[PDB]
Structures are given as structure tokens and as C-alpha cells.
From TrEMBL, chain A:
Name of the protein in its database record: Periplasmic protein
Upper lineage: Bacteria, Pseudomonadati, Pseudomonadota, Gammaproteobacteria, Enterobacterales
InterPro entries in alphabetical order: Aldolase_TIM, DgaF
Amino acid sequence: AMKLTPNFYRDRVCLNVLAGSKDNAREIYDAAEGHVLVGVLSKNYPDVASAVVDMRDYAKLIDNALSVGLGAGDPNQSAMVSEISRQVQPQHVNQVFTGVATSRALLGQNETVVNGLVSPTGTPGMVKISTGPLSSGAADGIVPLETAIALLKDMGGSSIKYFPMGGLKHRAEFEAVAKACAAHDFWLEPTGGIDLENYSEILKIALDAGVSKIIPHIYSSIIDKASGNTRPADVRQLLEMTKQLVK
Amino acid sequence: NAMKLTPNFYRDRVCLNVLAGSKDNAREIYDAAEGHVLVGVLSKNYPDVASAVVDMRDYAKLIDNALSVGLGAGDPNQSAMVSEISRQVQPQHVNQVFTGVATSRALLGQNETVVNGLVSPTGTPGMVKISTGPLSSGAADGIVPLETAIALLKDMGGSSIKYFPMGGLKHRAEFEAVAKACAAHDFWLEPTGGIDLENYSEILKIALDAGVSKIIPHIYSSIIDKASGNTRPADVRQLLEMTKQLVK
Amino acid sequence: NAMKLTPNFYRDRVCLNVLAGSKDNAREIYDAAEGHVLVGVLSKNYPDVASAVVDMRDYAKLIDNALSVGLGAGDPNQSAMVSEISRQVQPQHVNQVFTGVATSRALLGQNETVVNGLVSPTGTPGMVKISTGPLSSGAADGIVPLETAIALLKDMGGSSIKYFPMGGLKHRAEFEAVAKACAAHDFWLEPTGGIDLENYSEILKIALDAGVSKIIPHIYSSIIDKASGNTRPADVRQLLEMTKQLVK
Amino acid sequence: SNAMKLTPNFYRDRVCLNVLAGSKDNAREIYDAAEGHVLVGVLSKNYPDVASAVVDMRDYAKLIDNALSVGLGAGDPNQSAMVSEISRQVQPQHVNQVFTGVATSRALLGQNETVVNGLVSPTGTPGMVKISTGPLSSGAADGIVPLETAIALLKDMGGSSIKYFPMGGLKHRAEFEAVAKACAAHDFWLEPTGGIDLENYSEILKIALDAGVSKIIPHIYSSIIDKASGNTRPADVRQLLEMTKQLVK
């Protein structure tokens, strides 16, 4: 009735794409047959109260399939995202490593999916966890994937948001992230450089590894720069490539 | 009209942290330290949140809220319980594992209570282990530079590093690096493990000499009478005395 | 920042209080009233304090903290429970019996949440029954002048009189005296019992004309669908419009 | 706590004196003079803030096994909030409150052992008591209720006893006899206060004993206080103790 979990296609994959407008949010939700989380960014609002009002309105248009975003990769939006999420109660929240537990605490329930941003390092098996407001300005803090997953679980997280993935430029690092998420019972949100031409290959890496639930994020490659909207036809194409792989 | 939510540091620099074995022991400790103490009561010593909250509220009132809510081993499986207890009790101080700092801060609902975060030696000065939570403590070690551990803890609402198990003076160089980093990066330090009356001044002086703004040494087993379970008030008086001789 | 702890009065004068039958109903009520409502959730619909706290915190988040913690038909046996629930939830509004107002205020720990106090008709305009607590409701009636009831409630941390059971307009002279006293002695008024769409304007206008500064009318059974137990959002829209017409 | 008990030391589970101390020395002398069957009053109005009252009162209490009674200083009602806040930290055996402060003090104490009285007053009509004794309510028209109801109200608000003040000694004898009868009938404690002196103490105490009130805490202030020093005379406390032993089997 007010659903707090995402609509995974055959309990495996849910798309995450950005809305350019309220009408675009509705377009996107229809194009994905509901198997999507529609991103709205906190950086687009000057203050928490302003964002709560507007994001509730978005959420109501799409049966709560909202993903609260940071925006422009800015970790300084973390606190705002946590406070917005408390009142909005969306299906999905994007956080930096140091904001996951705060968002989980302010949500007050375990149903909403809360990701935690960790980054490639150039060394398969090791990820950067120093992705918060001050920690992003410090020397890198880099830990094994197993350990990043356990840290995120201990902090109320649901998934790794692996960013910037670099499309297929760093295949070995991405393979290791998928292997670790499968081995340690955690979900994965691949983000950065995904487009219509590499989507199937990227998704299949995570499916083949045995990751239980996967939320690919597809931003700039499917956004019409003239309007700022995510293109419905591209959403339909992503859905069909997903159905072809998840069977 | 609420009770005070921040510790009573001696000359804005040092506050002792010691365990109570009883309500009367807590009163005697608080007197012996002239108020410059946080008295630890352990969540693991109660069967449920409600029994901890009721008892710890009473401890707190007797000592003007100079209560430190403990895990009870730095035990990470007590983390969620400590966060809920602390929410309801509203103490001056909370002990957390790395993965519980933000939860405790969020549930406290205010920025005054001091919340530590447990990070640990690695064998390599400058590098600390942050994988101290329930599941992370069983995973491969997650080790980061001190600057980064401090920034991570600040981002998560923490006030200080609880550096444990410090090993007394067995790993002096690692401890010196911790104190240096807390001074350089404007963070507080809570040295814990192996402190006794004979090494207290040396250990405290490392942190003072480094320039750490606020220091909360924890002194547990060496000052506890095993027959009663009480911290010895005379040992607290001596700890205060040694503190005064170094801080002026 | 914590959520807002005071009600959202329409033109600083009137805030509706109606009951939610579900989480969705709370959301619909809040929309229907354009935010000028306190959505009641009854303690009696939970078996224990924690159960109530967990659910009411979720209600509150969905409606920006515009929650009213209910006894359940003014039941004094729910008073202690409501005081502890309210301490943990931190709502905008609390319903209390006369002997629970101070306890709720003390446990809330702040003066922003509105706490009402139940006092009742006697048959004599100007005199109200204050013996509305668990044991005092079973004793001979304690009956005092309105001025005195107001001063007692203020002294005990109360914000308003909950005047119950008002009987719609059946005791209009007594209600007119309550409104006059609240205006004269600078206190708020919560008319409760027998309010419906046919008498609402007249009842509200008695309080408005008397000069009561803040009024929180409670409208329960007349606007509740018996099958679902939900307050009809259309009736909340109607109540809001009747309020706007009277509060220019 | 074990070393600082929260309930008064009643003589033969029946009577505990309540008198004011003018100094820590005077508190010790009083406590000795009463053989421990006393609550020593220290007044909130003698401190500029809660913090200073807490420090000093905690030191008083430590000298006398926690036999401390936190006072308003007048039955004064504007001290009510301060008394509640002091008591939260002091955790005394006894707290004086006005009618509107009983529940606040109980809530801030956090436990049910400390005795919290509630001031209610004569009306000229035996059986009826004035409950409007708080900061603003004391200035309103009188709120008068039956004794049964006043007791039930105080119980509902976490109270332990009625502080019946101002008694004017035996001036309100019939009213006081009815208060004692009601407290015995409704299982509540009684703290007679106002105008008690060495000449009327036995008769006043015996009214309450004869009625069957289960715990009685008489308050004896001005008649036993040396004005020049501000100290309660320990010799007067010894006399009051002996009068109590003569009446309590």
C-alpha cells in the first residue's frame, strides 16, 4: 500500500535512473513496468523542508519507487539526505560510507534499501571507504571487499554503491566486487559509465557471479541533454535487456 | 533545566574514566576524582535495555550525569543495545565500536554527549584497525591511516578515538602516532588497556606532549578490588593527583 | 535538527484533532487539513509501551510530527503509559488526565509539546471536576472554580483544558463559561465530545468569540467510518473549510 | 542506595521528626539528638541555583546517612521547580512539595521510595481541604475538595503524604482530627506543620496516632530555632524525641 522495498524484476534486478521532472518520473515508472527506482537529488533543493515536500510529491506519483540522491557526487549532501529520508520514507536511499547508519537510524525501519558509496582503487579486491564529507579529503582509507561489506552491514546498509565503475575499463576490479558481494551475501549497485551498449555485459558479470540483488544506475548516457529528462525509450530498452538476462 | 551532557575535564584537558562496582562505589569515585571523572556502567551486566536504562539513570543522577555507558568488552555485540540505552538515558559519555558511533549519535539526538569510537593497533604506527563492529570484527582487518580514521569518526558524529587494546606501554610507538594524529587533526583521545598507577603518568604525558586537546584515560582492572568488584577510591585519588601534576 | 514540536495552528488560532485509523489514513488526514491538524493515535491500541513507541514514531515521521498521543476515550488507566510513550516519541501533542499533566511535562523534558488536561462538566457553569485520574476518578468528586483549574493546570506544566465529555451543545452554558475563563486567564481550550458537522461551527464560534487564543477541537465518532475505523478525509476537508470561514 | 537509604528512619515504624538545620554542625547534632529518627531540612531558597544546592545538600546528607528533607522555604510555592530539580540529583529521603509539584518531583526522582509530601490547607470546614497551593493556583480562588479526593489526587500524582499546613498549632483542631481520620481510612501518611511547639507537640501527635495514621512526620520549625544563630536547639529535639517515645509503643 506504501511499499518500502524496491520492485526487483524476478527478485533480482531493479533499475535506478534520474527523473528530470514529475512527468518524467511517471514516464520512467511506466517504461520500466515498475522495476525502477526514480532518483531525485537533494542538491536540487536549498533546504530539508523544501526537499521533503517535493520528494513526497514525486514519491506519490510513482507508488513510492523513489531513490533519494546526494547529487553531483557531493558527500556534503549526506546529512540532508538522512533528514529528508526520515520524513519521506522512500524505497531507496543513496549514502556515502559515513551516512549509512545515520540514514538507517532516521528511517527507523529495515525495509528501505540504503546503499553505501565505495570506490575503485586500481587493485582488485580493495575498495576506498573514505567517501564522507571530511573523510573524502583525507588520505584514502582502503579495505578488503569482505571488510567493506561487513562494515556496511554493521551500519545498517543494504548494498554497495560501486562508483565510479568506469564502464568496462576496470573489468577485473568490478569482477572482484561482484565475486565478494556474492560470497558475502550483499547487494550491489554498479554505477558510472553504463550505457545501452555495455549494459548487458556489465549486468551479466554481476548475475554470473551470483549477486542476489543488483541495482544498476544509468544516468548521463540515457538523459536527453536538451530537456534534462531520462529517455523513456532507453528505459524500455534497459528493461528488455534485463528480462533477456534474468530468466 | 536538564542535567549536563558534557564531561567535567580538569583544566579543560583530562577526564578520568573508571568502572563502578555499585551505586555507592560510583558516589565514592565521583568524590575521589573531584568530579573529573566519567563512571562506567556496562550494558552487558543487564539482561535487557529496560533494566539497564532504569539502573543507569539512577547511577547518573547520583553523579550529576557523569555516566559512561559501556559495551562491556569493547564487546561489539552490545553496540545496538548501547545505542538504545544511551538514547533513553542521555549520559555524558558513550563507548561505541566503529560501526555504532553514528547510530548512537543519531539516537542521542544531540551533539553534546561524547561518543567514542573503538579503533585498534595494527603493529604499524600510523595505521589503525577500524573493523571493530559485530560482523566487521570477524572479517579480514580493515586498516586505514590515522588521519582517515579521525575524519571517518568525525563524519559519523564521533567525538574521540577509543584506542584499545593499547597494551600499556608495550606498543609505545603506535600510541605516540595516535596521539600525534589526534593533536594534528583536532580530535580527542581515550587511551585504554593496561594502564596502572605506575605507567599512568608516562602514558598521559605522551598524549599531553603530543598536544591532544582532550584526553579521557580509561583505567579498569589495575584499580579494581577483585573481591568486591569496586574501583578503589584511593586509586582514583592518586590518578587525580598524578593528573594535576602534569596538567597546569 | 529534530522534527517540529508545536502544532501547526491555522492563523495562529485553531488546530483540528482527529483520530487516524491507519498509517495511510494519517497521511490523508494531514493532506485534507492542509497540515492544520494533530492526528491522534491511541495508546490503548497497543499492548505495551515499546510497541506503541515504535509504531507512533513511524506515524509521526509520515506527518511531520503532527501526532497527538491518546489515552483512548480519556481513560485515566492509560495515563502512565501515555507519559512514557510521549517521553520516547516526542510528539506535538499529548492527551492527559488531570493527575498526569505534570508527569508528562516532566518526562517530555521540554515546554514545546502541547499537553492537555482533562476536566469535566459538573452541571454548574463556572465549576469543573478535576478528579479525573486513576484513583481520583473513583473518589468523591473534586470540584473547583474554572480560574483555579486553569491555574492548577498551568502550575503542572499544562497547555490547555481538555473539556470532556462536552456533550455537543447539551451543556452550552457550562461551555460558554469554560471559554470565557480560558480567555480571561490566558489558557488554551480543547472542546471534546459530541462534535459533528452540524454543531462544529457554533461550538468553535463560542470559543472564538470569547477570545480564547488557541483552540484544538476534537472530532471523533461523528467523522469515523465504522467499518474501516478511519476518519473520513472529506469530513476533515469540511471541518477545515468551516474553520477558515470562522477564522478570517 | 545501600549507604544512603531512601526512606526515613521512623521510630517504631510510626513517627519521624522533621526539623531544620542551620549548619552542617547543627545537622549532626540534630541527627544525634533524635537518635536518627529525624529528617533534617535544608531549604532550596538558601541557594542561588540548583547546582550549588545540590553540592551543599549532598554534603549534608552524607553526614546524616541521607536523612535529608529538601525544603521549599515557606511551603513557598515558587521554589517548587527548584526543589524537584535538586531532588533529582540529591536523592534524599524526603521532599517537600506544593500540590502542583508532587508529580514533577516523583518523575525527576525516578523512584518510589523517597517520601514526597503535598501541601494542602485548612478551609474552616472539617473534611474539606484546599489544594490550590502552587505558584499561580495559590493566587486563584480557592480549590477545595474532600479529603478522600485530595488523598486520591496525591496518590495519582506519586505523592506519599499530606503536608497539612498552616495548622496554627491546635487552632484548627477539629479540621486536623478529620485530616488524620481520612489519612488512616485511605491508607495515606500525614505531616502536621505550623505552630507546633514543645507545649502542644504531644497532643498534636497523639491526634494522628489515635486516628491510626500509619506514618507521621511532624514538622517543628520556628518554635525550636534559636533566632540569633538560626540553629535548631538540639535540646528541644531531645525533648521531642522523648515525647514521641512516651506516645509510641
